[PDB]
Amino acid sequence: ETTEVIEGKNITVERTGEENRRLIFQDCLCAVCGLCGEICPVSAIEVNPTGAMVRTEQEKSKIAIDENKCVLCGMCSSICPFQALDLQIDGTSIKELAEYPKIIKSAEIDDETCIQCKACETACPQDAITITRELPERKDLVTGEIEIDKDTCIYCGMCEEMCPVDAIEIDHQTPSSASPVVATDIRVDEDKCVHCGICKRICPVDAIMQVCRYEIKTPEVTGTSYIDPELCVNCGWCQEICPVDAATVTKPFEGELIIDQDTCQACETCVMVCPCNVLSFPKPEKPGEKTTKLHKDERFCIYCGACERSCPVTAITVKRNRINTTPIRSKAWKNAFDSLLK
Amino acid sequence: KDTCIYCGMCEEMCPVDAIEIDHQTPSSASPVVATDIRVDEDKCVHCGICKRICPVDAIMQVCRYEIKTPEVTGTSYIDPELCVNCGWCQEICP
Amino acid sequence: MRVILNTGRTIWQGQAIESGKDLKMYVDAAAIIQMNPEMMKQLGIAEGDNVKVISEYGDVVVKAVEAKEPLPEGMVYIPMGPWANRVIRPYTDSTATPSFKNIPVEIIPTDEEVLDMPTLMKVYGK
Amino acid sequence: AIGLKAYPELCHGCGNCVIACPVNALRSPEVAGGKGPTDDVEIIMIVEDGVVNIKNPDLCGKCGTCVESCPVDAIRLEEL
Amino acid sequence: MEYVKNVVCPFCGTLCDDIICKVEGNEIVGTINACRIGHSKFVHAEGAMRYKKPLIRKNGEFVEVSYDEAIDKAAKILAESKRPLMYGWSCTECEAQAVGVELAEEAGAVIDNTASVCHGPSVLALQDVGYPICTFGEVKNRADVVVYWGCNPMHAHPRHMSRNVFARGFFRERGRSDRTLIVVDPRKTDSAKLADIHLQLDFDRDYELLDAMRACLLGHEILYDEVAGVPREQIEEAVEVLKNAQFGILFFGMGITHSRGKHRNIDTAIMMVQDLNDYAKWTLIPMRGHYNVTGFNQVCTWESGYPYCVDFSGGEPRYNPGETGANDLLQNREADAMMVIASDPGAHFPQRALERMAEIPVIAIEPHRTPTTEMADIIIPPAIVGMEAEGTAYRMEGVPIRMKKVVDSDLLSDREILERLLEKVREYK
Numbered sequence A: 001e002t003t004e005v006i007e008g009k010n011i012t013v014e015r016t017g018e019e020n021r022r023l024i025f026q027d028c029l030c031a032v033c034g035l036c037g038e039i040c041p042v043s044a045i046e047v048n049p050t051g052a053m054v055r056t057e058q059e060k061s062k063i064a065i066d067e068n069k070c071v072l073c074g075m076c077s078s079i080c081p082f083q084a085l086d087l088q089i090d091g092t093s094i095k096e097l098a099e100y101p102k103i104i105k106s107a108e109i110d111d112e113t114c115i116q117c118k119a120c121e122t123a124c125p126q127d128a129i130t131i132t133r134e135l136p137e138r139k140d141l142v143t144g145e146i147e148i149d150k151d152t153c154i155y156c157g158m159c160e161e162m163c164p165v166d167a168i169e170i171d172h173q174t175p176s177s178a179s180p181v182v183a184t185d186i187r188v189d190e191d192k193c194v195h196c197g198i199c200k201r202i203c204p205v206d207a208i209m210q211v212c213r214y215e216i217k218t219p220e221v222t223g224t225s226y227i228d229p230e231l232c233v234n235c236g237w238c239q240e241i242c243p244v245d246a247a248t249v250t251k252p253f254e255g256e257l258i259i260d261q262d263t264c265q266a267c268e269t270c271v272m273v274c275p276c277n278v279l280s281f282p283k284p285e286k287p288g289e290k291t292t293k294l295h296k297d298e299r300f301c302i303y304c305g306a307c308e309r310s311c312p313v314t315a316i317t318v319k320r321n322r323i324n325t326t327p328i329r330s331k332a333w334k335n336a337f338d339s340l341l342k
Numbered sequence B: 001k002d003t004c005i006y007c008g009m010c011e012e013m014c015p016v017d018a019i020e021i022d023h024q025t026p027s028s029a030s031p032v033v034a035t036d037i038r039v040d041e042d043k044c045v046h047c048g049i050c051k052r053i054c055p056v057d058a059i060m061q062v063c064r065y066e067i068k069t070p071e072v073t074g075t076s077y078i079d080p081e082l083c084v085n086c087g088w089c090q091e092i093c094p
Numbered sequence C: 001m002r003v004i005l006n007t008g009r010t011i012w013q014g015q016a017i018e019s020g021k022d023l024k025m026y027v028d029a030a031a032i033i034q035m036n037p038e039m040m041k042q043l044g045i046a047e048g049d050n051v052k053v054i055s056e057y058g059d060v061v062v063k064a065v066e067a068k069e070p071l072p073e074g075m076v077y078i079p080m081g082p083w084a085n086r087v088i089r090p091y092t093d094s095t096a097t098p099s100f101k102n103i104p105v106e107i108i109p110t111d112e113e114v115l116d117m118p119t120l121m122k123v124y125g126k
Numbered sequence D: 001a002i003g004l005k006a007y008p009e010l011c012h013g014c015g016n017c018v019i020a021c022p023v024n025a026l027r028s029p030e031v032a033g034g035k036g037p038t039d040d041v042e043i044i045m046i047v048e049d050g051v052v053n054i055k056n057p058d059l060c061g062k063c064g065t066c067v068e069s070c071p072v073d074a075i076r077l078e079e080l
Numbered sequence E: 001m002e003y004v005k006n007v008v009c010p011f012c013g014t015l016c017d018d019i020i021c022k023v024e025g026n027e028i029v030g031t032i033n034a035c036r037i038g039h040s041k042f043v044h045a046e047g048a049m050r051y052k053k054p055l056i057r058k059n060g061e062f063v064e065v066s067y068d069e070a071i072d073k074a075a076k077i078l079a080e081s082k083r084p085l086m087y088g089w090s091c092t093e094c095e096a097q098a099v100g101v102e103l104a105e106e107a108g109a110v111i112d113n114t115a116s117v118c119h120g121p122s123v124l125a126l127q128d129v130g131y132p133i134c135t136f137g138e139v140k141n142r143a144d145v146v147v148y149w150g151c152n153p154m155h156a157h158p159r160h161m162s163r164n165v166f167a168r169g170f171f172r173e174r175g176r177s178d179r180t181l182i183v184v185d186p187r188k189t190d191s192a193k194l195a196d197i198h199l200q201l202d203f204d205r206d207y208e209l210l211d212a213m214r215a216c217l218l219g220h221e222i223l224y225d226e227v228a229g230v231p232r233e234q235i236e237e238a239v240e241v242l243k244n245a246q247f248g249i250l251f252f253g254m255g256i257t258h259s260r261g262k263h264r265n266i267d268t269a270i271m272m273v274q275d276l277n278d279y280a281k282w283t284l285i286p287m288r289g290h291y292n293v294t295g296f297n298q299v300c301t302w303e304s305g306y307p308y309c310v311d312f313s314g315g316e317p318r319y320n321p322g323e324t325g326a327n328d329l330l331q332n333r334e335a336d337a338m339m340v341i342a343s344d345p346g347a348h349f350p351q352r353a354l355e356r357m358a359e360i361p362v363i364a365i366e367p368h369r370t371p372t373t374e375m376a377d378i379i380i381p382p383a384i385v386g387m388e389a390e391g392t393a394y395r396m397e398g399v400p401i402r403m404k405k406v407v408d409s410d411l412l413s414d415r416e417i418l419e420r421l422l423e424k425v426r427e428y429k
């Protein structure tokens, strides 16, 4: 017997027996593209409207699975390009089973080439990239010597006020007949000093010497780069944004985007829905200049179809001419994957 | 601003916050992580840290006719009602 | 409690004046005082409780109501009408325009009743 | 069964939703331009008798634009 | 059920001219396109008093009379007054307003409309510094920054945003998505909820805030690190948004006409808009309240030379808001008779003014029961403009649209009542 448990937004469908099968749906990863419901051979999945699940708050999940129809074949988990559906067999996910088809996609950063500029981290539309970097200590980006002649110094306090980095400290005091001085010491924190020479130039008694200048380690920037495979959607923004061509991406699907600008009424739904940041509303550069109403850059498109699905006036259509997978050994699966071409 | 790749390291390392970058989230219509970079030369103290941290050598920075010499001005007042004539001022004066 | 009184339009007061100032609809929409939930707690009142509003220029009784349009701390809102115009500042500073908005007032709970439209106008001794 | 649902007792009849709707806009140049339709046109909803009134819900694509343009939660997409 | 399309709504200064009226048996029973307020005026609400016939009070109870007798009593009052006030005007059409001016001259009256409790401060401001405006269609087709300063259109001009912001225009074909929406209000209004930037400033500090914005605009550093509860950095960011507009519009309302500084809040708003035009095309529009408050100021100005608070006591027109305004004559106890037409000062003047209306004869041209009719000594019910009578009205930015007569009425129109009244006042002298 097939059963179902709905924990929060998530859905689990289980069949026990000699072979255990569990289909797990994480609502937080679903982009509501609808592909699972199209490929389902028993029409067990019904997907909710893509716009409403993204722009409004809903109590229900993005999809609904009919336990009575689900046979736990896992075509849905095999096609999903957002890693939102997983079929586990005897505790093991089908992504680990070569007999099961797997879409072909990747995203890598060459750490040797990467200079830790953080552009990809900023541009990633799924916040799947983490870039850490260690800058040198400030004191290593300046070289110079500085000394204050504490005898010549009259403790006027002008250097202390004018230091742009508060590197000079004076030990002020109220005089007494036993200590007839307005200060007892002056110091330069050479960890803070950036050797701008302002102090020397303001000093009224020329008490400050300041000048800018063997194997010292050269100061250099270090860092790391991580791509979360569960969040990574393979749009290739990282590959394009990178200034040193350090990021490489490959996509599962090939296809075409077609927009009817005159049908589009610029409600922005598809723009908000697109998990790859393909679609946008350009701003005119000059008063009286007109722009393309709905702009696209297919360099970032993965041809999932969420935008086309979300558009209430059908202004966008998504052609899909190829789905790259590992070997599809079942001819019945092969035809079901081919049913998604258009 | 063409060579600049907007890594933002100068902006972080400037000891006086003289560099500002106009960061943004990219869009397909504006595929860049920033739109401008500026140096407030009123704040800049010409320490050259930015130039030395830049990974693409986008920053030129160098330390260098009648310009008025900068000098300190001020005033001095002694309140005769409060002044007690102890002479601390006479002795403390450098 | 000393609060700042702001006054002006609401869609419900607009519907009420074009139906009829004589209807109960108008009292329910303009003889009210909108307050933030937290101010009602500190004063010990709930929705529906009546409030005495005293200013330097007069006094009035209005029904307390939670503000669906949140107010800044220390501010209350009474919709425009004869109840609000019991307490706001009349002087025009030689412009002809009275100070209808942002007037220091005292607010306290009261078991007293809200006057309806014909009765409230009786205070002016016509 | 998510679909459009009005709350006319919360509605100002302000018209934001009617204008923002891309379906309404596509079908009526007047609506597209912020006007109430004067020409007889079949759209999803109008303001009638001072409140939003769903007329042809079969045309709704449940995109949520109208919902996000209303500040008083007088029109929503939910289970029916 | 005849359908009447292209009706002009007689409520607010948005002056929607796309209303559709449902007419069932010489009665308006429903509307299309009208907002909840507009619908309310078009349709009678059950139980509400609609005065069928003239009234005169004798012992605190009114008595029905004819138009001629009630107009005769009214003309008697005005003709023997030495400082009569003729107030209201904003909810009637322009021909009635024009008879009112000729009557005000004949009677030696002060004629004033609702501007003196509304955008009169804006009128005083624009007389000192100017008036840079545009019409709605320009906002619709060009504007990419829209600012609602001290107004709450969702509650007071309900279709204003849909008609000007969500609307798609020629150079703004994406509607709402092509415009930066700014609301300035101490409250989190339902208008501010729709905004991209909400400046939730301290009340009564707009003038201070605009001083910082203007000074920042002209290249000056802002003295204080927070103004009107708005941080310095946020003020400079706001000014940059205005400077980068291709076409900006500043809508504004009672939040700055009624609050501290009054006309000087508008003054400084206007001058910022003017000076913005060295960086970006900028205009403003005052959110005129009643559907034809703008019309009275137009008529009065072109006939007498002055817009409101006009005193004809000396024959020559004279003008001094602060002296010759409605609330000034009442609060200083100058007026000895008040004629109210198409307005409700009983509900909407302060108590100090109401104290004077109780001491003087009050005449009310009013179709409904209001606090004013409670303070009244004569009541004269008219035909309602835009439902039962036609005539010109002026939208908030000066566009003249002719109100339409949708149904018939046995009642006299405002214009008729005033014309007979004028004739009788001439007589009584």
Ligand SMILES: Nc1nc2c(c(=O)[nH]1)N[C@H]1C(S)=C(S)[C@@H](COP(=O)(O)OP(=O)(O)OC[C@H]3O[C@@H](n4cnc5c(=O)[nH]c(N)nc54)[C@H](O)[C@@H]3O)O[C@H]1N2
Pocket (backbone or CB within 6 Å): C006, C007, C008, C009, C010, C011, C012, C013, C014, C015, C017, C080, C101, C102, E012, E013, E037, E118, E149, E150, E151, E152, E153, E155, E156, E157, E184, E185, E186, E187, E189, E202, E203, E204, E205, E206, E252, E253, E254, E255, E256, E259, E260, E287, E288, E289, E290
């Ligand atoms: N429902 C309804 N609609 C109407 C009318 C009505 O009676 N009812 N009458 C019509 C008329 S006559 C007019 S004039 C218009 C007026 O329409 P609005 O100009 O919107 O008038 P108000 O709602 O009184 O005030 C608007 C806002 O000013 C804000 N405010 C108060 N103090 C300050 C301040 O110090 N600074 C700032 N920035 N804002 C402040 C308030 O929070 C309020 O939300 O409405 C018209 N429409």
Ligand SMILES: Nc1nc2c(c(=O)[nH]1)N[C@H]1C(S)=C(S)[C@@H](COP(=O)(O)OP(=O)(O)OC[C@H]3O[C@@H](n4cnc5c(=O)[nH]c(N)nc54)[C@H](O)[C@@H]3O)O[C@H]1N2
Pocket (backbone or CB within 6 Å): C007, C008, C009, C017, C079, C080, C081, C084, C085, C088, C100, E090, E091, E092, E093, E114, E115, E117, E118, E254, E289, E290, E341, E342, E343, E344, E345, E347, E348, E349, E365, E366, E367, E368, E370, E382, E383, E384, E385, E386, E414
């Ligand atoms: N506390 C406070 N007080 C305020 C305000 C505020 O914000 N706060 N705002 C002030 C402002 S801005 C204004 S303008 C006033 C509101 O100004 P009012 O003019 O007092 O507003 P209404 O109550 O709409 O008055 C219009 C009256 O005219 C009647 N009428 C409608 N159509 C016609 C017609 O064709 N002919 C005639 N003869 N009569 C007609 C209506 O039934 C109604 O009673 O309130 C002011 N008072």
Ligand code: SF4
Pocket (backbone or CB within 6 Å): A029, A030, A031, A032, A033, A034, A035, A036, A037, A047, A062, A063, A079, A080, A081, A082, A083, A084, A085
């Ligand atoms: S397929 Fe598209 S829709 Fe079906 S799950 Fe993966 S994401 Fe959600």
Ligand code: SF4
Pocket (backbone or CB within 6 Å): A023, A039, A040, A041, A042, A043, A044, A045, A065, A069, A070, A071, A072, A073, A074, A075, A076, A077
């Ligand atoms: S498992 Fe095979 S069946 Fe159950 S849903 Fe996913 S697809 Fe339709």
Ligand code: SF4
Pocket (backbone or CB within 6 Å): A109, A113, A114, A115, A116, A117, A118, A119, A120, A121, A131, A225, A238, A241, A242, A243, A244, A245, A246, A247
């Ligand atoms: S962009 Fe290229 S370089 Fe900059 S961080 Fe991402 S990867 Fe490293």
Ligand code: SF4
Pocket (backbone or CB within 6 Å): A146, A162, A163, A164, A165, A166, A167, A168, A188, A192, A193, A194, A195, A196, A197, A198, A199, A200, A210
């Ligand atoms: S050099 Fe520049 S920084 Fe170093 S102390 Fe003198 S002043 Fe401060």
Ligand code: SF4
Pocket (backbone or CB within 6 Å): A148, A152, A153, A154, A155, A156, A157, A158, A159, A160, A186, A202, A203, A204, A205, A206, A207, A208
């Ligand atoms: S400036 Fe020259 S003198 Fe004055 S304190 Fe610094 S050092 Fe001593």
Ligand code: SF4
Pocket (backbone or CB within 6 Å): A107, A123, A124, A125, A126, A127, A128, A129, A227, A231, A232, A233, A234, A235, A236, A237, A238, A239, A247, A249
């Ligand atoms: S590919 Fe698209 S998603 Fe995957 S990282 Fe590079 S960017 Fe983020």
Ligand code: SF4
Pocket (backbone or CB within 6 Å): A263, A264, A265, A266, A267, A268, A269, A270, A271, A294, A310, A311, A312, A313, A314, A315, A316, D022
């Ligand atoms: S395409 Fe359809 S969805 Fe994307 S904007 Fe135009 S209308 Fe809204």
Ligand code: SF4
Pocket (backbone or CB within 6 Å): A257, A273, A274, A275, A276, A277, A278, A279, A300, A301, A302, A303, A304, A305, A306, A307, A308, A318
């Ligand atoms: S645009 Fe390309 S990626 Fe973005 S939604 Fe449509 S298809 Fe999926």
Ligand code: SF4
Pocket (backbone or CB within 6 Å): B013, B014, B015, B016, B017, B018, B019, B039, B043, B044, B045, B046, B047, B048, B049, B050, B051, B061
């Ligand atoms: S020089 Fe020193 S100060 Fe001037 S900008 Fe570069 S870093 Fe900041």
Ligand code: SF4
Pocket (backbone or CB within 6 Å): B003, B004, B005, B006, B007, B008, B009, B010, B011, B037, B053, B054, B055, B056, B057, B058, B059
């Ligand atoms: S460091 Fe060199 S590159 Fe990075 S931002 Fe400053 S300038 Fe642009």
Ligand code: SF4
Pocket (backbone or CB within 6 Å): B078, B082, B083, B084, B085, B086, B087, B088, B089, B090
């Ligand atoms: S110091 Fe002694 S002397 Fe010099 S001022 Fe102060 S009191 Fe007069």
Ligand code: SF4
Pocket (backbone or CB within 6 Å): D010, D011, D012, D013, D014, D015, D016, D017, D018, D047, D051, D052, D069, D070, D071, D072, D073, D074, D075
């Ligand atoms: S629904 Fe929300 S938006 Fe559509 S009309 Fe009623 S209020 Fe205006």
Ligand code: SF4
Pocket (backbone or CB within 6 Å): A312, D004, D020, D021, D022, D023, D024, D044, D059, D060, D061, D062, D063, D064, D065, D066, D067
């Ligand atoms: S949901 Fe999208 S479509 Fe359905 S109405 Fe609201 S807007 Fe028009």
Ligand code: SF4
Pocket (backbone or CB within 6 Å): E009, E010, E011, E012, E013, E014, E015, E016, E033, E034, E035, E036, E037, E038, E157, E158, E159, E160
């Ligand atoms: S906006 Fe003012 S005018 Fe247009 S309908 Fe609503 S009320 Fe009538």
